[PDB]
Amino acid sequence: NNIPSTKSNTFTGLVSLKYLSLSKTFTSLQTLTNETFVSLAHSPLLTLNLTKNHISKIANGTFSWLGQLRILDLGLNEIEQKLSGQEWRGLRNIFEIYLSYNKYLQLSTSSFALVPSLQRLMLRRVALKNVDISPSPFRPLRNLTILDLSNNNIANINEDLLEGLENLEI
RNA sequence: AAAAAAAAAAAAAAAAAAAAAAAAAAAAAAAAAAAAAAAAUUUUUUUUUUUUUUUUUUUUUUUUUUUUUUUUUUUUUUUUU
Ligand SMILES: *[C@@H]1O[C@H](CO)[C@@H](O[C@@H]2O[C@H](CO)[C@@H](O[C@@H]3O[C@H](CO)[C@@H](O)[C@H](O)[C@@H]3O)[C@H](O)[C@H]2NC(C)=O)[C@H](O)[C@H]1NC(C)=O
Ligand SMILES: *[C@@H]1O[C@H](CO)[C@@H](O[C@@H]2O[C@H](CO)[C@@H](O[C@@H]3O[C@H](CO)[C@@H](O)[C@H](O)[C@@H]3O)[C@H](O)[C@H]2NC(C)=O)[C@H](O)[C@H]1NC(C)=O
Ligand SMILES: *[C@@H]1O[C@H](CO)[C@@H](O[C@@H]2O[C@H](CO)[C@@H](O[C@@H]3O[C@H](CO)[C@@H](O)[C@H](O)[C@@H]3O)[C@H](O)[C@H]2NC(C)=O)[C@H](O)[C@H]1NC(C)=O
Ligand SMILES: *[C@@H]1O[C@H](CO)[C@@H](O[C@@H]2O[C@H](CO)[C@@H](O)[C@H](O)[C@H]2NC(C)=O)[C@H](O)[C@H]1NC(C)=O
Numbered sequence A: 001n002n003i004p005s006t007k008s009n010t011f012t013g014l015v016s017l018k019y020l021s022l023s024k025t026f027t028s029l030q031t032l033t034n035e036t037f038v039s040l041a042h043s044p045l046l047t048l049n050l051t052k053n054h055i056s057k058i059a060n061g062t063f064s065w066l067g068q069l070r071i072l073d074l075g076l077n078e079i080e081q082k083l084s085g086q087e088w089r090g091l092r093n094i095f096e097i098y099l100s101y102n103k104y105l106q107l108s109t110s111s112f113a114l115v116p117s118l119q120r121l122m123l124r125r126v127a128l129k130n131v132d133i134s135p136s137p138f139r140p141l142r143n144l145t146i147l148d149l150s151n152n153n154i155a156n157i158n159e160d161l162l163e164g165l166e167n168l169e170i
Numbered sequence B: 001a002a003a004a005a006a007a008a009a010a011a012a013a014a015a016a017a018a019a020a021a022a023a024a025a026a027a028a029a030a031a032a033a034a035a036a037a038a039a040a041u042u043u044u045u046u047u048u049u050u051u052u053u054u055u056u057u058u059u060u061u062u063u064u065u066u067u068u069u070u071u072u073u074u075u076u077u078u079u080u081u
Helices: A037-041
Strands: A019-021 A047-049 A071-073 A080-082 A096-098 A104-106 A120-122 A146-148
Touching: none
Parallel strands: A019 A047, A047 A071, A071 A096, A080 A104, A096 A120, A120 A146
Antiparallel strands: none
16 A cells, blocks of 8 residues: 555554554654554554564654554564664564564664563564674563574674574474 | 400291191092983884775676466367357
């Protein structure tokens, strides 16, 4: 679709919505603030698609009202910012994150502290840098099953990465 | 009472010379010191600009294999009004 951007009460009224897809829908959406998905406060979403939406910036607490959201997609996007953990604020029971196909995703030791209940995490060709810092960004995470960091050309790695991750399988 | 000549001693003061020294100031010569400015041999460290080798990410180009839709060039055996 070709909607430029959403409004304050665009999705207001959906009290039972759980499957929402917005792939290749937004063209004027360059920066994601915490006033875009305010309409989905009462919507118990479970899946979310946001591929090909030309998303380049997300603000702190953007998905704060997405407490019941479990699956969200952010692949095939132009995200260029610093991950500090507050981008996933408000995610009570999150399942997995589609965060592949990007151009720059800087990671820090607190980039994933807020959400410790992840199951799958793929970072395919997102050009990740500066990961070998101690402690590892994945210290709070324990329930991951699939971890993909392929096609990223990691500069360095140390022992602190991927230690104690008992639940990993892939 | 006073005045003078040969001849021998002693006391105050002034101007001198020589010798034995001792202090203050001034000149060098040696043995050291503390430094603010200096140069010169050796081994290392930071930063800027660039050289060589190896491993990989993005994009572009060539060749080969395979798959899906359209323009279709044809057809053999039949059907057909
Ligand atoms: C959002 O919508 C898009 C478009 O429908 C969904 O894309 C689909 O994603 C799946 C899984 O990533 C793709 O399946 C995989 O395809 C690859 C080839 O690209 C294949 O090698 C794998 O084995 C697997 O079959 C699927 O092809 C793809 N479809 C399209 C049309 O792109 C996406 O999954 C949606 N996201 C969410 C969270 O709903
Ligand atoms: C959505 O994102 C915006 C942008 O970051 C957030 O605005 C920021 O909110 C914080 C917290 O209120 C502000 O910091 C503090 O605000 C209080 C307000 O009383 C003030 O007294 C403090 O001195 C301090 O400034 C911050 O200034 C503000 N920045 C901007 C540019 O608006 C907003 O809070 C976020 N909303 C949600 C629901 O996450
Ligand atoms: C979104 O949340 C992150 C936190 O996850 C915010 O980053 C935080 O920003 C503050 C303010 O700059 C930082 O405090 C100061 O940081 C400097 C270094 O930049 C440090 O020298 C100071 O002593 C002080 O701690 C804080 O460290 C930083 N935290 C992280 C984890 O990066 C970010 O500002 C928020 N953005 C918005 C728009 O609300
Ligand atoms: C990590 O995964 C485990 C296993 O799925 C979670 O343990 C389950 O948690 C749910 C909800 O709290 C309970 O209903 C189940 O009975 C638990 N199962 C077991 C075997 O313990 C655990 O909660 C997850 N951790 C986090 C932080 O989400």
